[PDB]
């Protein structure tokens, strides 16, 4: 339990630091900025277009086909930070739809597909466009939501 206990402590402290605008580490800052960006993306998307999850239609036999058809079109002509947030939000919605349909078995698979796509097809762009540090500079401190509300 030693390492699970350290993990629980770190998660809790990271959360409480984030609530006051602080961070446990650079990685925690990235995670937080991405959480906040996803929340805001999904808010904008559902007000304009529909709840994303409600639009998704998955079964274990075609789950990757569903994922790939969307992700390949999203990035067909290139990458930018807004599309990277969209990618995360889509994967989140696909996982929620899967569990809605009693198919939590698909969640691990989706996470793997996302990590692989990030590594193979997004990271090369990220590492030439300022890296995750730039993502935090641009989206951290709930920046996207703050701009809209302004």
């Amino acid at each position: 339990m030693s390492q699970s206990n350290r993990e629980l402590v770190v998660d809790f402290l990271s959360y409480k630091l984030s609530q006051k605008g602080y961070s446990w580490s650079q990685m925690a800052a990235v995670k937080q900025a991405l959480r906040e960006a996803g929340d805001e993306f999904e808010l904008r998307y559902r007000r304009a277009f529909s709840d994303l999850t409600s639009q998704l239609h998955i079964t274990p036999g075609t789950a990757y086909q569903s994922f790939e058809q969307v992700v390949n079109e999203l990035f067909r002509d290139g990458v930018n930070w807004g599309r990277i947030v969209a990618f995360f939000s889509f994967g989140g919605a696909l996982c929620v739809e899967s569990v809605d349909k009693e198919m939590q078995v698909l969640v691990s698979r989706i996470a793997a597909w996302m990590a692989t796509y990030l590594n193979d097809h997004l990271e090369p762009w990220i590492q030439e466009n300022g890296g995750w540090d730039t993502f935090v500079e641009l989206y951290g401190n709930n920046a996207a939501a703050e701009s809209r509300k302004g």
Binding site: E40, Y45, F49, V71, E73, G82, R83, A86, F87, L138
Partner: peptide, 18 residues
Amino acid sequence: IWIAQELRRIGDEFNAYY
């Protein structure tokens, strides 16, 4: 490709230095 075009709606108009 409904979903992806209208992710690219929000994502391009979420995209941020310029």
